[PDB]
Subunit: 256 residues, 4 copies
């Protein structure tokens, strides 16, 4: 049986490493992207060349706004992502909510606050919520005998949000909501055997900071984070649910 | 000097107790409300009868949506207008208590009812408090240092039990999680202005059963049992506390199924 | 109608401030001390001059070791502290586990060093508070309900910063973690007796300054709120509040009093 | 061939941890206190599958002095780590799994020896011994020339996912696990320069002891949201093995719950 993984923001960096890792374990991967069409398509080509029909790409703005084709809502866009997996392969075993906007929203210095609120909250929290809902709906609608044996949802949280990055309030708030989603979905979906966990990087694949990380005095590589994601999705982690695992080299143990 | 407190959702229950307690300590109180006009106005009459010009009421839907003029009005604007009402009337705003909150189910397992739920639950519990804190801070920043108050305090009403989620209340739980994040982020960012930001998280308070599950007293709490903690955090005796959430839950979060 | 408070390590700094604040609220205070007899006795004199028979002092090494009189165990010494309140005033309403040893135990005539550090650091910060709470609770349980006080409150002095460990203080950090557990465990088990158990965790308070000024100033400057360590009152007022009847629904919780220091990262 | 030292390795989780590390290629030093027969049988099985891949060492990890000047807990702990170096010339992984667990009620409704031994036993096995073991483990790595050091040092502390929602009447045990969490963070920070990772794994309900009426047993496991059952030993041990693998080399100072969502419940 070939399981299917939907990974949002899979075009590069961590999402790509997650997609690659899942692919190496035998998963067919649906690579979501927003603006990185070229990178998403190149990654799909590479995976499909290794194993035919093992990758596809889907475009979607995960910001909490309506888009043009009656306007299309974020929920619809989200359901369409999950549906794309079912239409193409007939299944969706894993969902990795990785796509994320990250930029300042200083409390102390228009409609710029409007798009920021919708973009930061949508990608990091509201979209994951709808995606999880669509994912669960498809599992519930599948007759028990036909269901997969290892449903796993991973939310990409942030090991450092409890020690907030100055000026990033909305982003920090959204990761906070993502943690809540992880616990609430883990509890509510347990009866369907759908595990919901979080993985929270500290500093990874930086585009100074490095020297502050206790372990190795550097930010992590993409694999150092993605291997943890892959492990949580494996059958060896079947009793883990509702938990967030930090992958930060001891950074959250530091103080100013 | 008579300090001013803005309390959202002040018409009844915890909010009213918070408004009353602050009032008893000498604060002039701006009582925010959404649909409880009668209650808000009655509370205002009581406080003003006790001490003239010590209370006012301001209406606002804190849901993350555009309303119609009384161009559409955004939640930010409505939030800035709440803080501005304090400055216009009394020339100051020392304390902000983000208490207003919608709470109802959003089950993952069973269309336009989803969009209003998202905007309502997230707006009242998280987005509105963000904009309110922003407006509050901007007013403080724009005040010349020599004229600023000596005890700025913002309290976010969180929830002691959200880490042990109520089945079927996902959006609400997520919003409180966001509110916790706002508490920490605002406490860090606003420290230079000496604006403290803390949280108070009830377990079971003034239930309209679960009661017997509370380790301490085997009952839900009274409004005062929660409001007194809020008032204390607002006091100069709590001036070194910031970015922390205090549970007022009688040990309920220490339980397991 | 005068309540009694037992405060360990009450001779100076935070403990003194806690004892003074409880005294100002009308409590009679049993001031525990280990090595600071002179300071403890002076504090007692002050309090008793303000209000006769409102203060006493008891000496006790709270390290997890047997002392000389069969040898006396820590538990016995602990029970003896609580008993001292009952013998003198017939009651014990509040217990503040404040006494605490704090020095390095780096991981990277010597057997005596590691052996006494473990007992001292763990005893003062965790084992003694455990036995003191046990003693305190037994006295409440053995009191007929009609005579019991209406506001029993135990406060454990934790540390807002132990989750971001101070390099080289492992045993101390371990003991404070044990103290957090004691707070939650005692809060749950003692709820039926209406004995509230809470923690107060300072960040940097009345910071010891045996170091260059730039270094000392470097440390306080890291605190987001005020860029300074706190005063003793800034911590003690929170303790006093948690002990008051207005905090009677709060139990099993640890309150940070750190000016946002725990929100920082390197 | 890397070496793992696993305390309380004779049965249950420790056995499974020892077996899993063994299946990954580790030589395993199986520590035990009272389960000699079980430890030796486990060693026999491992050595039969791969010669010289297992040894056993006995030690009371309670915070008391033993019979030889009396022997201290620290010495006993240093001796465990040393036994790995003496036999195989290395110690790459340490799993602090041994743990005593029994009630210490605050209220009652010979005597002194039980209180004194409970404190030392519960605290020693769950916290003080792990401390001394980590210290011994670290001293050995520091004394090894960088050129001879292993490339994946990993320490795992077996914590408890449910201690924050205390088991009524288990105060000392709960206190010791809290200390263990502290040790995990403190050691992770201090040993980071030597590339020694220190993490925790905290079970919820695992291979639940069933010395009670079946319905009471069904009742407890049914409180667990995922699967409505306690976990298998492998379900916990596989997570330990994963954290010890090179795939987890950027993870340190973190405690991972393996509780099927139990800590998410409320009464
Ligand atoms: N790297 C780190 O040090 C770090 C630290 C802590 C947490 N994290 C978390 O780990 C995850 C991955 O980190 P990363 O650094 O790889 O992320 P990233 O490079 O910052 O962004 C990942 C992808 O998110 C997508 N995205 C952004 N806004 C979107 C929107 N409005 N709608 C749909 N997609 C959107 C983008 O896709 P397109 O390019 O196609 O437009 C982007 O490529 C994120 O959730 C992040 O919060 C990362
Ligand atoms: N009581 C508890 O057991 C409990 C437990 C945990 C946490 N809390 C938290 O403590 C706080 C107070 O609790 P409570 O029980 O007193 O609250 P509540 O009775 O449920 O509601 C408080 C007020 O919030 C206002 N509100 C709701 N939706 C709004 C919106 N869309 N826009 C503007 N205002 C809105 C309402 O004002 P109007 O009536 O004027 O329309 C309502 O009166 C809340 O934040 C709650 O989350 C309470
Ligand atoms: N100050 C801070 O920045 C800070 C930060 C975090 C937490 N805290 C916590 O707050 C509490 C009070 O802080 P502090 O700075 O005021 O404490 P402190 O000055 O360091 O010491 C408090 C007292 O504890 C007593 N003590 C130490 N070891 C003892 C033992 N073996 N047996 C009996 N008594 C012992 C000593 O009494 P004698 O002098 O009579 O011998 C000492 O005066 C402590 O629990 C501390 O851990 C303080
Ligand atoms: N099973 C669970 O549901 C559960 C839940 C939460 C956490 N945990 C943690 O996971 C770990 C393993 O759990 P488990 O249930 O497998 O443990 P266990 O069966 O209860 O005991 C493991 C071993 O610890 C050793 N031990 C006890 N006291 C000792 C002492 N004084 N000195 C030296 N060794 C001592 C014993 O070895 P000998 O038999 O040779 O004497 C015992 O077999 C423990 O740390 C436990 O706290 C388990
Ligand atoms: C620089 C920053 O602190 C850190 O490396 C993280 C924070 N969270 C992130 N989140 C997103 N979406 N993208 C990033 O690059 C990061 N970087
Ligand atoms: C009913 C629930 O158990 C609990 O009593 C709290 C949770 N959060 C709440 N939040 C709001 N806004 N209103 C409420 O009545 C409650 N009730
Ligand atoms: C020095 C350190 O950073 C911090 O201020 C605290 C930690 N805990 C303490 N605990 C005790 N007993 N005494 C102290 O002075 C302190 N100092
Ligand atoms: C019985 C309890 O609920 C839980 O399953 C755990 C707690 N910690 C434990 N610790 C040890 N050492 N052994 C055990 O069997 C357990 N069981």
């Amino acid at each position: 049986t070939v399981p299917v993984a939907l990974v949002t923001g899979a075009a590069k960096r961590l999402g790509r490493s997650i997609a690659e890792g899942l692919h190496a374990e035998g998963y067919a991967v649906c690579l979501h992207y927003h603006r990185s069409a070229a990178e998403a398509n190149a990654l799909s080509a590479t995976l499909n060349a290794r194993r035919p029909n093992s990758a596809i790409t889907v475009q979607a703005d995960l910001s909490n706004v309506a888009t043009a084709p009656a306007p299309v809502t974020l929920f619809t866009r989200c359901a369409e992502l999950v549906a794309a997996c079912y239409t193409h392969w007939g299944r969706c075993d894993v969902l990795v909510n990785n796509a994320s906007s990250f930029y300042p929203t200083p409390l102390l210095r228009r409609e710029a606050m409007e798009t920021a609120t919708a973009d930061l909250f949508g990608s990091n929290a509201i979209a994951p919520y709808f995606l999880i809902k669509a994912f669960a709906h498809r599992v519930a609608g599948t007759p028990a005998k036909h269901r997969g044996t290892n449903y796993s949802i991973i939310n990409m949280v942030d090991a450092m949000t409890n020690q907030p990055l100055l000026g990033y309030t909305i982003y920090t708030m959204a990761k906070g909501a993502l943690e809540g989603l992880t616990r609430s979905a883990a509890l509510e979906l347990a009866p369907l055997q759908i595990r919901v966990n979080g993985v929270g990087p500290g500093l990874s694949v930086l585009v100074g900071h490095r020297s502050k990380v206790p372990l190795y005095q550097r930010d992590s590589s993409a694999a150092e984070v993605s291997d943890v994601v892959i492990f949580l999705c494996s059958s060896k982690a079947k009793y883990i649910t509702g938990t967030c695992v930090k992958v930060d080299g001891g950074y959250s143990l530091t103080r100013a």
